[PDB]
Amino acid sequence: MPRWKRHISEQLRRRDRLQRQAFEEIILQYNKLL
């Protein structure tokens, strides 16, 4: 796999971990007690 393609894959996964995964559970929890 090319260098640039490996970078993007790692970046997209890093993005999800920092953005989506960080909030997905607590948002789901909060929505229930509303």
């Binding site: 640039w4 393609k5 993007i8 970046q11 997209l12 993005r15 999800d16 953005q19 909060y30």
Partner: protein
């Protein structure tokens, strides 16, 4: 392989805090609504639950066409959610703080969104404009009306396989060539008076070499090489093949929306 990149881009979410616009005098302060907004979608398409949420604490006479804003900046509903964040709020503390309004619609900054048919129209308009650059609109116009409906339904229902079952045709090119005729891209920049930069650019050089993201910028936006080149929340290497980017890192509207923002702290 490459399919993994497509899935990550597609299902990309953004933690967003919808706060109703109020003052320190209102009878009751409404509860803020948290939601993961799909990057590749639009505000007026995935905000029915937030509309129902706040319409409960308002009169029937006080409700109108809802509209969102960030830091006093009205949010264009025809811009993809991912693009707005990358350009406006990416270097601020999550979740994305969006203020919710109903009165005082800024008609000089926002286009009205009367229906989801209006959205579907704009979306189809972008795709045809994109394929006009890639294949002279020879691919999308030769599709059935059901194929156009499937592309829209796949985006609205968050169905990856359903959407890409048709979109795969809009990402292929004649065998004799090594890419599209022109790349559907739009370069945004808060500092420039222009809405975005969109010019004709061929993905292949004369000798046959593939043009890179650096080559694109060097040609159409050389005044950005200190700043971040952010696409879908990430900062790809400038050596990345532009042709490959258009195939994998494009939005469902087949456009390559690119943000040029200043470096953070």
């Amino acid at each position: 392989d490459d399919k993994d990149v497509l899935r990550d881009v597609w299902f990309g979410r953004i933690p967003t805090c919808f706060t109703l616009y109020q003052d320190e005098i209102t009878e009751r302060e409404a509860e803020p609504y948290y939601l993961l907004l799909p990057r590749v979608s639009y505000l007026t398409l995935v905000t029915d639950k937030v509309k129902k949420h706040f319409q409960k604490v308002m009169r029937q006479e006080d409700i109108s066409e809802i509209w969102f804003e960030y830091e006093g900046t009205p949010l264009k509903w025809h811009y993809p959610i991912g693009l707005l964040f990358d350009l406006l709020a990416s270097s601020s503390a999550l979740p994305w703080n969006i203020t919710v309004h109903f009165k005082s619609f800024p008609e000089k900054d926002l286009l009205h969104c009367p229906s989801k048919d209006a959205i579907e129209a704009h979306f189809m308009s972008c795709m045809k404009e994109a394929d006009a650059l890639k294949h002279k609109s020879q691919v999308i116009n030769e599709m059935q009306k059901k194929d156009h409906k499937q592309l829209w339904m796949g985006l609205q229902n968050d169905r990856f396989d359903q959407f890409w079952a048709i979109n795969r045709k809009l990402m292929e090119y004649p065998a004799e060539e090594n890419g599209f005729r022109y790349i559907p891209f739009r370069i945004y920049q808060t500092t420039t008076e222009r809405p975005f930069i969109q010019k004709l650019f061929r993905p292949v050089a004369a000798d046959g070499q593939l043009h890179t993201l650096g080559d694109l910028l060097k040609e159409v936006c050389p005044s950005a090489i200190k700043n971040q080149v952010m696409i879908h929340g990430i900062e790809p290497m400038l050596e990345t093949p532009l042709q490959w980017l258009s195939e994998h890192l494009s939005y469902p509207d087949n456009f390559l929306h690119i943000s040029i923002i200043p470096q953070p702290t």
